Every structure is written in structure tokens, then in C-alpha cells.
Amino acid sequence: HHHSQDPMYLKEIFVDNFRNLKKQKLEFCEGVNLIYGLNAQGKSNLLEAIRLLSMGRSFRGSKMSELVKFDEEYFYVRGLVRSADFYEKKIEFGYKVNGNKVIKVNGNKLKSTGEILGHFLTVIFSPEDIEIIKEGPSRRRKYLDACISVIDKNYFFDLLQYNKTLSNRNSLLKKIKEEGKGEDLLEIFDEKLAEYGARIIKVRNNYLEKLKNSMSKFLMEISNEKLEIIYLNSAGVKEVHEENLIREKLKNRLTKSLTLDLKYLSTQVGPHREDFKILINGYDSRVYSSQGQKRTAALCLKLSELEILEEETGEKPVLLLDDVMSELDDNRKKYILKKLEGFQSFITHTSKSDVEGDCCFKIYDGIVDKLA
Template sequence: MYLSTLQLGAFRNYDSLTIHFSPGLNVLYGDNAQGKTNLLEAIHFLATGRSHRTSRDPDMVQEGREELLARAAVVRRTGTIELELRCGLQTRKQLKINGIAERKIARLVGSLAVVLFSPDDLQLLKGPPSGRRRFLDLELSQISQTYLHHLMAYNRLVAQRNTLLKQPVIDEGLMAVYDEQLVETGAQLVVRRAEAVRRLSPIASRYHRMLAEDREDLELAYQSQGVGDDGAADLETVRRRLERELARLRSEERRRQVTLVGPHRDDVGFWVAGRDARLYASQGQQRTAVLALKLAELEFMSEEIGEPPLLLLDDVASELDPHRRHYLLSAVREGVQSFITCTDLEDLMVREWPADHRLFRVRAGTVVLDDRGLS
């Protein structure tokens, strides 16, 4: 798949803009604060319905304007899909696919998929478990509308259950209904996440060995109250274990007035050379592991979707050393539409640009095609 055209109106510092991208490599370069990341954000927004930088959609509306517009033409093997998202300061997001209004933003799943690598991802290993869960959720939600549906229902349920736990007198009948739903929906999420991590682990390990020049191994494991000690993560086992945990933590939950059982408490374990990377990894080891994970995500999603998602690389040149940068850029060339932002083209250290690359100079909310990159 590739994004052939992006059109923006009143989006961050873009008043009005239309860009035609290369199906291969697209480099967005320019000084700081000119709008490079805003373009990646717009692509992420069109793919997932959400910004990767803010949970408040109105932040993306240009200052002084009422409503933003983001449109994309996505070329898939099966044909071109036109996506349109509008979002106002006071109004909810509105989606159109091929000109037809869709009531649910979740209908975006299956049109445009992205893998984003930004400097914030370097916190993925050492940061809190919520970041690692978000990583999995974002990946799986882009692959499966069913997963997204379960995730949204689960998040709603946990919020409702927490409200109930805070009541002075708990309605036990309602709690029993919530418990049943938590086990059902929670188990669906655990099974799918555990399977994704099981498949990501050997792919990430392969990339990691190449990046670390065969010196160290990387291993991933999904850690959950629902997964058996032997790693069993089939639906029945997960359901049974969640039920057991609900019974075991019943009084603790009431005392703390918060839901303590379910996939919102899970984590992904990373081991580098047999040691827990979340605790022990050096800066360099973290970078290598995260890079391996992102490349694994790209491969996993390509397998699931049947064609590669877009790769968005935000300012990676400043964060990665020449060896890792070179490795990442070599992965970029193989039939994956890629978008790279940088302040200086020299930083990418590309000796020979691929034939289908385009260079775009970004300056104060304008984007100009640089004819060195015209193909």
C-alpha cells in the first residue's frame, strides 16, 4: 500500500496543502518547528483516527480556525481508497471512506496502516508498562477491527467497574455482570496480544542479532495474569485464570476501589542476553532492542495485512548512531513506502538515493518538492 496524495486544511501549521508522494522513499527536511512531524501526525491520524502526540483531537486544529480537514488517497492492491477526516473544536470527528460517511471511526481499520518510529519510542523499554501495552494495541487495532472493538468495549467496562467499586454500597448483581464481561472481553485481548508477542519475538530476535552483530539475543514474552506458567494462552485457560484472579483479589479490589485483574495490568517482557532489559539495558541496548522491535512490527503487520504498512521515521537520524541508521535505511528500501524527517539531509548519510525517492523541503507550513528528488 502507499499514500499517493495527502491533502490538509487548517491542520496544525498547514493552512492548505496538497502533496503527491513517492511510493518509495519520501524525505521531509527542514529546520526545527517548521511542520515535518505535523505531516507524519496527519498520516498517523488518517491511518488510526488518532494523533500519536495528543489525545485531544482539537489540538490539531490550526489556531484561529474551527475545523481541520485531512484527506488521503491510498493505493492498495485492490484499488484506490479515498479517506477523509474532519474534526472541529466543538464537533466530533467525521469520517468518509470513498465519499461515503461512516458513523464509526473504527471503520478506518483496513484502509491505511502505519508503523511509526519516533524518539519517544526509545522510552518503550524503560518506560511504564502502559507504553508497551499501547504499542501492542495500536499494532493489533490496525490489523483487526474485532480487536479494536474488544479493546474499546474493555476500556469502557473497566471505567464502569471502577466507578462501581467506588460506590459505598456495591450492587452485587451488576458486579457479577461486569465480572463476566471482564473475563470474556479481557480473555479475547490477552489471547490476541500473547499470540502477537509470540510471533514478534523470533522476528525481533533475528533483527536484533544482525544489529548487535550476533553478540546478543533478544527475547519477548507477554506477561499476564491470564497466561499460564507454562505460557499457555488459549481462550479457555485465560478465562479460567482471570476468573481465579478475580476471586483471589476480590477483597483487595474493594479495599483499593480499582480493578486489579485484566489485560490493562499486563506487560511485555524484554530480555537481552538473558537479562531483563526493562531493568538492565544500557542506552545502546535499548536503542537496538527498540529498533529490532519496530522492524519486527513492520514484518508482522505486512504478513497480517498481506502488504507492507507505511513506515514513518521521525527524526531518527539524530537518535541513532551511523551503524543503526544505516541498517534502518537499508530496510526502508525494500518495497515499503517510507517517510523520514530530518533537519539536515547529510545526517541520513545516504550515499546513493533509490530511484523512486522524493525530497521535500518543509518551511513554515509549506512543502516544496526539491528537484534533486524528482523521479
């Protein structure tokens, strides 16, 4: 329930010592904001600054200290956003090289970084999205956790507490190994991991269900191929619903894992070792397909992220398109650029001819010049 259907909208952003960007305030437009310039001038840095306001981290996976302008002691980003319930919401993110970060919403300091989700909703499309198709469980897992956490605060809560308990269990393993004086205390942590692990598996399944439905729709439209998604959960359950059952299986598996865990000083059982497999027609897309369909599968995955996010939050997000509008024979552009219709979008490119923005910004040397 919201007071309006005003889409998410970034009125302006202010960047101070952020990457190579000069200290500046940028005011944006409704519709397509074209950001163009030579390679390495600051295009992706600006998208990274905008995406920071949504996630509280670099979409590139960079450490915070890497976003600080070389030889400075802090960076600071401030966005003013409009959303369905807010004519204006101020979002501030300051980070100092000594580790101190200060995140504020409407002038109130957030107690943790995760509390920044999703005051400002974005979906970012990037060439590296094909890595979610190609790389290991870790990549897919990090992606899934972020998709869900953005729309579901209780899951994010669970994930945070799970990781905390996991960390405690792992250090306990060290303490048991470093002595003879502890295998025992593991039971109570085991019980907790199974409870939180089961809640997480349940929600991951709910999302993957929705993911498969939406992706099957998109895939069948542009490639006429058939999508399946297999969730390799840690409970070994091929069809997950009874949370009771999953809890017991996870707990049994933890107990049977004790010797192995003492050897590796880690926990092989749980959500943090899971994966999901993406199947095209019947084959594993990670291995059995070419680069045409991986790029296609990546697109469908992200199109689905967008669709699920809108439906679950009742908000319309801002779209970030990083270096994904090059190439593109133009019926393959005619499809996407019209799909951007009712959104505010930020599109990076090499030229301002190819794509027509409603507002256009040239960046050279970290300096952003509105209107070429």
C-alpha cells in the same frame, strides 16, 4: 487474498488548519519522500497528519483539539491512497473543536473512529520508540493493543467491549460504595470481563510469540545478543492456551479482589494491568542495560512490527521515519536506507544532502516547497 500486490501508497494529502501547516495539497513520489527543514517548521506535524489517516489519532499522544490550527474551529485532512485492492481510496478526517469528528472512506462516513484501521497501513519509526523499552506497563500495553488492533479486527472488537464492560464495572463499584446497596450485581460483569479478558490474553500471547521470534532474528543479526519476552498476563498463567482455564482464573481473581476494588474504586484484575518484559541475554532490558542496546531493542521491536504487519495483512505498508536519520555512521545508514527499497517512505531531516530522496520537500513555517 488480494487482487494484486500493489504496495500501500499515498498519492497525495491535503491539509487544512492542521497544526502550523498551511492549507495545501501535496503530491508524493514512489520511493523516498525527503521532508527537510529547520527544527520546529512542520516536519513532524506532516507525518502526524499522514499517520492520522492510519490510526485516527496523533502518534504523539496529543489530544485532537491540539491538532487544530491556533484560533481555528476545525482541521481537515484528506489522503488519496493506493493499496493492493484499490487503485484509489479516499480517506477523510475532519475534526471540529466542539468535539464533532467526521471520518469518511470513499465518501462513506464511518460510524466509529476505530473503523479507520487499516484502510491505510503505515509503520512509524520515531526516537520516542525507546520509551517502549524504558517506561511503564502502560506504554508497552498501549503499543501492543495498537499493533494487534491494526491487523486484527476481532481483537479490536474484544478490546472495545472489554473497556466498555470495565467502565461499567468501575462505575458500579462507585454505586456500591456510595451506598450499602450493591456488591451483588458485580458477578455478571465479572463473568463478562473474564470471557473477554481471556480472548484478549490469548491473542496477546499469539502476537508476543511472533514478536519474540521476529525480534530474536533481528537482534541476533545486528548485536549478536539473545532475546527473550516474558508475558506477565493477569491470569498468572506462565504458558497460555486453554482459554477455559484462563477464564476461570480471571473470574476467581475478580471475586477475590472485591474488597480491594471497593477501596480503590478500580479493577486490579485484567488485561488493563498487564505488561511484557523484554530480556536481553537474560537481563531485564528496562533496567539492566544501557542506552545503546535500548535504542537497538527499540529498532528490533519496530522492525518486527513491520514484518508481522506485512505477513498478517498481505499488504506492504508506507514507512514513516521521523527524525531517525540524523547521526548514523554510514554503514549504519547503508543498512536501513537500502532496507527502504520497495516501500514508499517519508523521511524527515535537517538537510537534503545527507539523505537522497526520490522526491524532496522543504518545509519552512508550515509551508512545504517541493524540490528544496
